[PDB]
Amino acid sequence: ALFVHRDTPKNNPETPFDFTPENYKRIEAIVKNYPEGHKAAAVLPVLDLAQRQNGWLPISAMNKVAEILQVPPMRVYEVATFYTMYNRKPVGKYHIQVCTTTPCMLRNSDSILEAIQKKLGIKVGETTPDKLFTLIEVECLGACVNAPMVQINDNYYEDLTPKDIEEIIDELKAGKIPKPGPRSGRFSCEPAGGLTSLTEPPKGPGFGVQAGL
Amino acid sequence: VNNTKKWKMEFDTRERWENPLMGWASTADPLSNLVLTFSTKEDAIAFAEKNGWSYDVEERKVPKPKSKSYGANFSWNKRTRVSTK
Amino acid sequence: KTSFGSLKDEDRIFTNLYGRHDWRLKGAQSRGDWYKTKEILLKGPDWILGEVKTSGLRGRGGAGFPTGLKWSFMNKPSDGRPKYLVVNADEGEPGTCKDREIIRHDPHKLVEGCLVGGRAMGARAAYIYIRGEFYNEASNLQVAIREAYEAGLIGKNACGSGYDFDVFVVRGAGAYICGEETALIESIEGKQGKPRLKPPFPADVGVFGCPTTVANVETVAVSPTICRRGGAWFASFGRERNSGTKLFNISGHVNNPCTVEEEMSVPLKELIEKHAGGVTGGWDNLLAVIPGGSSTPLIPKSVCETVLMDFDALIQAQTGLGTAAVIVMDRSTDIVKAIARLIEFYKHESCGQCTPCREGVDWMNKVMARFVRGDARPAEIDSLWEISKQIEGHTICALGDGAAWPVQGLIRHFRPELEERMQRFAQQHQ
């Protein structure tokens, strides 16, 4: 939660971080997306790549992203402390992100936050002692009509009841990976009692096309 | 820049020494706090010449107009890109 | 036309909005996408800009600037620099989840919109700044872009038109302020997502220093449908200066929270009770509606009975259209807790650059957190109003405005509930 760094023995510029060679080819493909002379534009993907290889960002991932992009290290420290995904502390293997803004608080995300707390025995910000679950409390994840919902590491688990998130946590402890979807009856975002629109078949190519084209 | 508006006449600083009793700054210079204020340079020169004071004039150092551009912080090909904001 | 709404399924742009069809290329070409794209590209930039100006399309990002007028800022000769279309796929607005549905379910429509729009504005490539939280949607979109390259639809000689055009996807990293177009530009350039000052507008100095148009996913994806179906088809929906169709996200205290494509000037009550199953506990259970996502002022039940869901009728209802994200709030809602949580969102999502937002949004969150408990006095309500009027208009981007407007709507429509909250705090703690 702090925004200054102190050298712990496990987080220092002598902490071993280095990319794998397939990640070096991924970094080459990232840097080829930007114009020649604006290599600094590859700070945000490559550093996020360092969060996918490692799980979190020590201050050797930041210095390595600084070194291989020829940017000053402060310009990577700013990006790492500005954007909320970059874990500058080690998180659990499953990083549970409960949305508690108004479209999800109105549909009782408080009960699900309480359910994850009384299930894992932890509270917001704490990591479980087996380092498998980190529970924090995030802002709008952009799945508002599927409220209430959580995010685990790539995935949105939507339309949740406390029993549904208890069951998702139960099968995350068992090793399997669940399906990122609404745990109610619907599929993505449709009205829950059947389609109020888009019931007719789509027309296809040529429909309604104006003359002179 | 409101203190850089009018011309000023001061004098050469003479000796300040330590009071033996209290350690204060003792002086023997009557004109040590005399700062005169003039609208233009020539009024100051005329007041110095009228009173028999040997003077020296430093000309007004005006700041030259700079070329300011906010979008120049975000250029395509120039070195004047800012690395942060 | 006088009454609006009840849009037909044949008049939909976002077919396969619900994920019920194949989002990949063989499904998309079977739904009208990528049809005669080369004939759109070959007719020049001026014809496409004229079809977008004819359609009356305004900015679906939420401010509603005229899209043809905005894209005609790029119709200017080359000064050596390349030109870039940049798709704003951030969508950090609470209430708003429509661009997630476009990217996840109609990705080839967005890719064809990138091609047609960048042809209109003479652009070289498309940087789709997608939200970092939308990972599955980003890989979904990348699969569609691979299908578009392998079919020769984009890239070298895009659709066989002799026009070179790339489509890139840059992922965000968790900042709502990176949906603001200049802060999104600064985020693509590898820096902190802090908004630039205007002018220079991004058409003059944009991404990397280049001429650049940032446009929303919806206002880009509906552009091949405007080019195929004609601009007059798109202008034949909604009121005048309120043309077209619109995605709506009705969430909160409705029976069936959903995304729906609907005609532009539809009534709010008809939209809620027709596509969302109405407010929970009946329409008499309605307390308030935030009409267009968190940044717009809320409107109470006595405004929601008659209001139309376009830009102008919501401006006349002293709110805004915004992202057309309808957050419905019933009578059981502590509305001060919801608005104070929304101000807490705006201080957590605020890049800290200029003084009035950086200081006053945290100061409004502290005042709103005391207003929830009632730990205040009524002379602090008007004071809070003044704080919002010192943040609104004086900031660099419109997140200060978007933080000021929920406070102003809550005060303007629920000052007596704040005053009774504070007086009952006073009489139960003294």
Ligand SMILES: NC(=O)C1=CN([C@@H]2O[C@H](COP(=O)(O)OP(=O)(O)OC[C@H]3O[C@@H](n4cnc5c(N)ncnc54)[C@H](O)[C@@H]3O)[C@@H](O)[C@H]2O)C=CC1
């Ligand atoms: N979709 C979402 O997730 C979110 C949307 N919003 C919406 O964003 C809106 C604010 O957006 P802004 O861009 O700050 O407002 P607006 O003042 O700036 O401008 C809208 C667009 O018109 C263009 N424009 C306007 N005047 C121009 C000129 N003279 N020259 C060149 N281009 C010009 C701008 O480049 C911009 O793209 C809010 O009203 C809100 O509804 C806010 C938060 C999240």
Ligand SMILES: Cc1cc2nc3c(=O)[nH]c(=O)nc-3n(C[C@H](O)[C@H](O)[C@H](O)COP(=O)(O)O)c2cc1C
């Ligand atoms: C704080 C803030 C956040 C914004 N976020 C988004 C966004 O996530 N997506 C979006 O399309 N527009 C967003 N906008 C609006 C943009 O500034 C811009 O108007 C729009 O992205 C592109 O213009 P258009 O509406 O014509 O498409 C945001 C504006 C502000 C002030």
Ligand code: SF4
């Ligand atoms: S008002 Fe807030 S969001 Fe905008 S430039 Fe300033 S700190 Fe950033």
Ligand code: FES
């Ligand atoms: S409010 Fe929770 S996802 Fe948007």
